[PDB]
Structure 1
Amino acid sequence: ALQTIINARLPGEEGLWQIHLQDGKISAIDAQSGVMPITENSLDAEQGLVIPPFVEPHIHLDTTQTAGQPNWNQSGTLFEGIERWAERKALLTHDDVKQRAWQTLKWQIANGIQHVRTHVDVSDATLTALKAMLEVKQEVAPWIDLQIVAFPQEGILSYPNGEALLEEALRLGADVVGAIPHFEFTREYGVESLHKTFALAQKYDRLIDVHCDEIDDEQSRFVETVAALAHHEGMGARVTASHTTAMHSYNGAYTSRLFRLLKMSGINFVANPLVNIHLQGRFDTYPKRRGITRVKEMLESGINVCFGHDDVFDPWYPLGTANMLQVLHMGLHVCQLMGYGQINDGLNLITHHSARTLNLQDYGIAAGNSANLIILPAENGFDALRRQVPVRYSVRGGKVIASTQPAQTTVYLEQPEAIDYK
């Protein structure tokens, strides 16, 4: 029974802090006068950084761990990736989905992630993965709050019975309504699909998260419809546009006009840097575009944007350990957010901003909130990011659910010396 966390650093704060726990909540946060000694019922942060848990705002748990089955994505494009998935989706079973989803979820728990939004392909008359994932959500609840997006991978209007399947997924309990307007057969189907998505979200009172303009096409502007509909319904906080990689290729005048609406609408954005850098720019020769959405500009404008991993060893991405600091590292480089302050504040892109994207209410290190928090063996966000630190402890409801004993490196020169890379 933990009653206290001691010797903790907090972002943007001086010295050490003591975090008092009570009934699985944070009761108080008090400054320390110095390093406190270990005591029974206390957890020693060892002068590490305490932050709320990492969030994964965008992952595909139904496809995770399937790379190469039955074939590899040779071109490394979104479009072949969908072809490869269709082959694998025909082989999906209930147990298959749950086994693979849980494998990745365990990596996530180990990585201090306590909030996850997974998209699940509902372009499937049997709804096999969706129904399986609704079970996983209940099973993993003690460790991760999992949101499920009903994601119509092959289109709402462009797939047989797509709209009916999407609605059935909501009836069954999916938390979020998805869409994919740039993959619909026509621009008109794309726009109409968004009207249907918003209608369903209002009917069932659910969140929205659209796979939006994931394509190097300067004419793909479905994001403006997502934002306009959100604004009209007054529901911006409940709405997310994922990817928006087309925005990387927009002219600046249109982008300027668009940003006014994006800010007024209050919708959220997810960028997926590991996957975006891999899949975008594939139809360029040289020079080759980066293909990530306008993260730096969004931040400058106070538009909420955050980072997701998207894919973990699957048709779209052959790598990954579900690590959010690694995602952040890629995002900072590709988006050129490389100022000291920008790097130090980078933690926000995988914590607070992502919590806002998931519409979370019980999140943050504050008295009254659930005792959900993680401890990094690092002095601040910059240090954590530079050294790619593991999660020392993950605490949920005041209980430790994960811990990492950090690696220990020694060099043998004239005498043994410990190396910490600081």
Structure 2
Amino acid sequence: KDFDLIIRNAYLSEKDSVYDIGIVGDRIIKIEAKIEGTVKDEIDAKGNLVSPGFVDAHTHMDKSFTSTGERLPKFWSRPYTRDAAIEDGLKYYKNATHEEIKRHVIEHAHMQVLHGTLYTRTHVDVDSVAKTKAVEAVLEAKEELKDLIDIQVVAFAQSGFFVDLESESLIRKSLDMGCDLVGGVDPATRENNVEGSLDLCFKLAKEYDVDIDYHIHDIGTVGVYSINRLAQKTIENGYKGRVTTSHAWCFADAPSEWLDEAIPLYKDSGMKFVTCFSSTPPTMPVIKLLEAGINLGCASDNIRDFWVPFGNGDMVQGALIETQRLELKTNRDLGLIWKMITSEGARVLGIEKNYGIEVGKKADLVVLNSLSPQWAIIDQAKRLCVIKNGRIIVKDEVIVA
């Protein structure tokens, strides 16, 4: 047989036309309006959109689904407060067993896969309370999930390198255990040492030759300042394109003049950003950043826990949420949001070379029940089929093998 798998009549948005997709093994090897040749299995997209696997560029798989179990979501029957949320996190990581954490990660992964997400980057809490317990469970689950989804693990110094002085050693162990990236939190309001926390993070990064993904929530000018120091140090340490800043809420409230003068520095350092649809500020300059050529991905962030009660791990649902938060309507704008949940996310993860519906690339695809990116966002229709490494793993809202 010429092909292991063929998807007939697949509308490809990047080419704006219907085609057949020829797959052998884990790669796409042919794309034509009508491909001749024998094949083992066939799927009829019936002219509907077929796209590459969605990318959820920022998750917390280890603590997900912790709000579930009761008539009402736990942790939310009281006004939201940063302290009560930080406490809930300490309790959880203290009493949670290795098997508890692993099952949550697996629940999360299955939910993502069912919605077409085949790539994701999760952050794992690393402090003197969670130790490497959470790290061990995540890496274990990651292995058990390699045939369903690709997971990047960030050793996340959640309490701050200068607040929990045990963080640095625990991060080395986590990186030694195999974590793919390292990251800290608010160098300013959390660490109270911008130069120190950033320099240390880069030190650890270089020791294990891993990339960086920083949580920067600080609003206004202090947030932009923190990001500018990070971008500048990125160039200094020869780390162009190896650094991601998550959230960057500060771009929504800092004077636009501050973002305008920093964009050249972000492009020169190849800084990557990720905005989570569970918190993207309405005034966040999303379209502006994309039009400027800045790499901006999208993500679920927390899912049903003490930080965010929401969550279905559905990037298509997230896209609709972004259009409402940002008040977007045109086909071009929805088209940009679709890029954000696909190719932009791929670039954030650094897998763009192998990402995309094109000859020679990975056979990781999603067959939707909608005519186009715009209609899929509007329709919110269920995925009809999900394919990873040339194998069908989801068929009609159910995980096959």
Give the TM-score normalised by the residue count of structure 1. Answer: 0.86
The AA in structure 1 aligned to 2:162 is: L
Partner of 1:159: 164
Q: In the aligned structure 2, how far is the partner of 1:41 from the partner of 1:255?
A: 51
Seen in structure 2, the aligned counterparts of structure 1 residues 183 and 167 have a Cα distance that, compared at 3 Å, is: farther
C-alpha contact 1:110 1:402 (8 A) present in aligned 2:
yes
Seen in structure 2, the aligned counterparts of structure 1 residues 238 and 84 have a Cα distance that, compared at 3 Å, is: same
1:192 deviation in Å? 1.1
Give 1:388-407 correspondences, 5 Å limit. 388-404=380-396
Partner of 1:318: 309
Seen in structure 2, the aligned counterparts of structure 1 residues 135 and 106 have a Cα distance that, compared at 3 Å, is: same
Provide Cα deviations, 1:42-66, integer angstroms capped at 9, x if missing partner: 2211211111101110000111011
1:12 deviation in Å? 3.9
Provide Cα deviations, 1:81-100, integer angstroms capped at 9, x if missing partner: 22321222211210110111
Larger Rg: 1
Seen in structure 2, the aligned counterparts of structure 1 residues 150 and 186 have a Cα distance that, compared at 3 Å, is: closer
Alignment identity in percent? 28
The AA in structure 2 aligned to 1:340 is: N
Q: 1:302 aligns with which of 279, 293, 297?
A: 293
Provide Cα deviations, 1:368-419, integer angstroms capped at 9, x if missing partner: 112111111111110000011221111111110002269xxxxxxxxxxxxx
1:40 deviation in Å? 5.9
Seen in structure 2, the aligned counterparts of structure 1 residues 394 and 234 have a Cα distance that, compared at 3 Å, is: same
Report the number of matched residues: 388
1:306 deviation in Å? 1.4
Q: 2:183 aligns with which of 160, 163, 178?
A: 178
The yes-or-no answer on 1:364 pairing with 2:366 is no
Seen in structure 2, the aligned counterparts of structure 1 residues 243 and 274 have a Cα distance that, compared at 3 Å, is: same
C-alpha contact 1:117 1:146 (8 A) present in aligned 2:
yes
Provide Cα deviations, 1:5-63, integer angstroms capped at 9, x if missing partner: 11110004344201111233111101249xx9x98622211211111101110000111
C-alpha contact 1:16 1:32 (8 A) present in aligned 2:
no
- Runs of 4+ deviating beyond 6 Å: 68-71
Provide Cα deviations, 1:177-207, integer angstroms capped at 9, x if missing partner: 01102575453x2331111111111121111
The yes-or-no answer on 1:341 pairing with 2:332 is yes
Q: 1:226 aligns with which of 230, 248, 266?
A: 230
Q: In the aligned structure 2, how far is the partner of 1:130 from the partner of 1:32?
A: 47
Q: In the aligned structure 2, how far is the partner of 1:241 from the partner of 1:85?
A: 23
Seen in structure 2, the aligned counterparts of structure 1 residues 184 and 174 have a Cα distance that, compared at 3 Å, is: farther
Partner of 2:45: 45
Partner of 2:75: 72
Deviates more, 1:310-319 or 1:21-30: 21-30
Q: Secondary structure at the match of 2:61?
A: coil
1:341 deviation in Å? 1.1
The AA in structure 1 aligned to 2:312 is: T
Q: Secondary structure at the match of 1:219?
A: helix
Q: In the aligned structure 1, how far is the partner of 2:215 from the partner of 2:388?
A: 31
Deviates more, 1:330-339 or 1:108-117: 330-339
The AA in structure 2 aligned to 1:102 is: I
Seen in structure 2, the aligned counterparts of structure 1 residues 336 and 315 have a Cα distance that, compared at 3 Å, is: same
1:142 deviation in Å? 0.8
Q: Secondary structure at the match of 1:147?
A: strand
C-alpha contact 1:376 1:384 (8 A) present in aligned 2:
yes
Partner of 1:10: 12
Report the RMSD for the aligned CA atoms in angstroms: 2.3
C-alpha contact 1:236 1:265 (8 A) present in aligned 2:
yes
C-alpha contact 1:273 1:308 (8 A) present in aligned 2:
yes
Give 1:14-413 correspondences, 5 Å limit. 14-32=16-34, 41-67=41-67, 72-73=75-76, 74-124=78-128, 126-182=131-187, 185-187=190-192, 189-212=193-216, 214-220=217-223, 221-276=225-280, 290=282, 293-360=284-351, 361-404=353-396
Unaligned runs of 5+ residues in structure 2 are none
1:243 deviation in Å? 0.4
Unaligned runs of 5+ residues in structure 1 are 278-289, 407-422
C-alpha contact 1:240 1:268 (8 A) present in aligned 2:
yes
Q: In the aligned structure 2, how far is the partner of 1:62 from the partner of 1:359?
A: 23
Seen in structure 2, the aligned counterparts of structure 1 residues 99 and 229 have a Cα distance that, compared at 3 Å, is: same
C-alpha contact 2:55 2:342 (8 A) present in aligned 1:
yes
